[PDB]
Motif scaffolding. Structure first.
Motif, short mmCIF file in Angstrom:
data_model
loop_
_atom_site.label_atom_id
_atom_site.label_comp_id
_atom_site.label_asym_id
_atom_site.label_seq_id
_atom_site.Cartn_x
_atom_site.Cartn_y
_atom_site.Cartn_z
N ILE A 92 1.06 -0.90 0.15
CA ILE A 92 0.06 0.09 -0.07
C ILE A 92 0.89 1.25 0.02
O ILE A 92 1.06 1.52 0.94
N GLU A 97 -2.40 4.26 -4.51
CA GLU A 97 -3.61 4.08 -4.02
C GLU A 97 -4.44 5.67 -4.62
O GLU A 97 -5.59 5.33 -5.11
N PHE A 102 -7.08 -0.11 -2.84
CA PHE A 102 -6.52 -0.86 -1.85
C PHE A 102 -7.82 -1.43 -0.58
O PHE A 102 -7.99 -0.49 -0.26
N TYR A 220 0.68 -4.69 3.27
CA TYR A 220 0.05 -5.59 1.76
C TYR A 220 -0.97 -5.34 1.89
O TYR A 220 -2.10 -5.41 2.77
N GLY A 221 -2.05 -4.67 0.67
CA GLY A 221 -3.03 -5.12 0.29
C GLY A 221 -3.45 -5.50 -0.39
O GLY A 221 -3.31 -5.36 -1.81
N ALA A 223 -5.52 -5.65 -4.28
CA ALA A 223 -6.22 -4.34 -4.83
C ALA A 223 -6.71 -4.64 -6.24
O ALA A 223 -7.08 -5.57 -6.73
N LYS B 104 -7.01 3.99 5.56
CA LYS B 104 -6.48 3.29 5.81
C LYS B 104 -5.04 3.50 7.32
O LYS B 104 -5.49 4.85 7.84
#
Ligand code: QSZ
Ligand code: QSZ
Ligand code: GLU
Ligand code: GLU
Ligand code: CAC
Ligand code: CAC
Ligand code: CL
Ligand code: CL
Ligand code: CL
Ligand code: CL
Ligand code: CL
Ligand code: CL
Ligand code: ZN
Ligand code: ZN
Ligand code: ZN
Ligand code: ZN
Lengths: 263, 263
Positions: A92, A97, A102, A220-221, A223, B104
């Motif tokens: 991320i 973004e 994300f 981490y996301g 996506a 986030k």
């Protein structure tokens, strides 16, 4: 319209996604194993979609070319409509973004230092104050951008060195960075995300180690393209998996249950 | 229409938001100090809005009453239109993300154990296997819900004990939980988020400590009502503050630069 198979982009990066031994000639998702393969199965189940795992064509995570303004890697596959979702160790970041969505993070990490055991380095400051030991990053990822953009004195000094060091201190894949540490007799240290560092630390021949604290803190996301109908459900699914303890169980499964360097 | 002052809901919780000494009779935002006061100033600056800090009326984080289905705490203030944004140690959870939006995360934490120094407890398993030492949580927050919902054997056993223990092992505020640990001669342990635990560990009289690993892994996020026009900019602002190192600097400022228990 009708339900459609979701195209998942991911990357061959251990232990997230790996080709199963002798599976190269088989078909579909059963060829692959790893943390992100297990995660994709759960996300798809909780969101109610069928999916096809695909390996990103250029083998990259995703960066925007300064000249052409084109996104590469998994980010590019989402941006240009080649994939519906990325389930991978994709960091991320602010610039990503802005162009993709994300989920909440499914794993935490920070930039960290990998040394060959015995290397007289304990910190980023130590690296920045000497020249005998070279150091670098993955060549097209969030770690390289962290150093390129940092205004923190020590990391700025490290970037000034890395960006002009010859031969290149940057590597094409994590495996190349690890191999370079292992064969350089202590004269190369690799800057990589703590998750990959701690995985390699538990792999034979057990000759690397993570040293010092992490340089930053992020995650981490999952996506999806901007405005995708999948984003809301995917985001909630990550939180559900987190609260159920599933993400913890998967980390232990792929990092430590299978550790090769003892208990 | 015209720009309007943004109503920020937050909670008196050290070191996030504190009344400055002798400021009770003053007006506006200058009365308060802390990590979330500094964060609110940066978020507002990066998003270009004026704001007014307000302390949540009922002193709670936010839970949904099972009978009336009404949300209380800061979550309720967003849901019912009493505030425009929550900038506080508000935990990202699935049930909250269904009714409000979270940025986030701006800080990571996990549930952790606070003991009075010398207490013979090292883990949640240790707590669950004995009865001499009582233990509890904040009475209307994400930690209590974690135990209420957990299917993990040890945490289920702890919940079965806590939910029927008499007198109540739950407390109304973090300060009450800390005071209970400190006065119970080792016979009460407090289950609280690692951020608050590690803050109190560095406060006089320096008689508590965090023991064992964290029980889970999650974070605090900035919350806005569903569909608020502020959410997108707030989310990017958090990532920018993260990547600039500002969140790290603020944590050090309010946790460790001001530590009272030595270096
Ligand atoms: O979504 S993030 O990258 C926002 C920044 C930091 C927050 C600042 C501490 C963070 C940390 C853990 C994680 F798992 C993800 C993220
Ligand atoms: O937004 S989260 O609550 C999603 C779950 C976990 C992820 C699973 C590890 C996490 C971790 C750090 C953080 F700062 C925030 C969050
Ligand atoms: N996870 C990183 C790649 C690895 C690294 O840069 O260290 C990214 O998403 O770009
Ligand atoms: N941060 C928690 C409150 C503290 C706790 O439950 O330990 C919440 O948002 O509910
Ligand atoms: C272009 As170079 C400094 O990575 O060899
Ligand atoms: C209602 As009770 C078990 O918290 O005293
Ligand atoms: Cl499948
Ligand atoms: Cl990036
Ligand atoms: Cl499994
Ligand atoms: Cl102000
Ligand atoms: Cl909750
Ligand atoms: Cl400051
Ligand atoms: Zn520079
Ligand atoms: Zn280590
Ligand atoms: Zn139960
Ligand atoms: Zn500690």
């Amino acid at each position: 319209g009708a339900n459609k198979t979701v195209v998942v982009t991911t990357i061959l990066e251990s232990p997230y996604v790996m080709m199963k031994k002798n599976h190269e000639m088989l078909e579909g998702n059963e060829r692959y194993e790893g943390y992100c393969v297990d995660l994709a199965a759960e996300i798809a189940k909780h969101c109610g979609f069928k999916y096809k795992l695909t390996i990103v064509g250029d083998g990259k995570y995703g960066a925007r070319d300064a000249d052409t303004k084109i996104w590469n890697g998994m980010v590019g596959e989402l941006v240009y409509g080649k994939a519906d979702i990325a389930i991978a160790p994709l960091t991320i970041t602010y610039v990503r973004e802005e162009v993709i969505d994300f989920s909440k993070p499914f794993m935490s990490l920070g930039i960290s230092i990998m040394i060959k055991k015995g290397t007289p380095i304990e910190s980023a400051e130590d690296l920045s104050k000497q020249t005998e030991i070279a150091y670098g990053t993955l060549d097209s990822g969030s770690t390289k951008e962290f150093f390129r953009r940092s205004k923190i004195a020590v990391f700025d000094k490290m970037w000034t060195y890395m960006r002009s060091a010859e031969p290149s201190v940057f590597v094409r894949t994590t495996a190349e960075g690890v191999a370079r540490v292992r064969k350089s007799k202590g004269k190369y240290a690799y800057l990589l995300e703590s998750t990959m560092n701690e995985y390699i630390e538990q792999r034979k021949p057990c000759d690397t180690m993570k040293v010092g604290g992490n340089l930053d803190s992020k995650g981490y996301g999952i996506a999806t393209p901007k405005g995708s109908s999948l984003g809301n459900a995917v985001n909630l699914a990550v939180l559900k998996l987190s609260e159920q303890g599933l993400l913890d169980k998967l980390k232990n499964k792929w990092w430590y249950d299978k550790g090769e360097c003892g208990s």
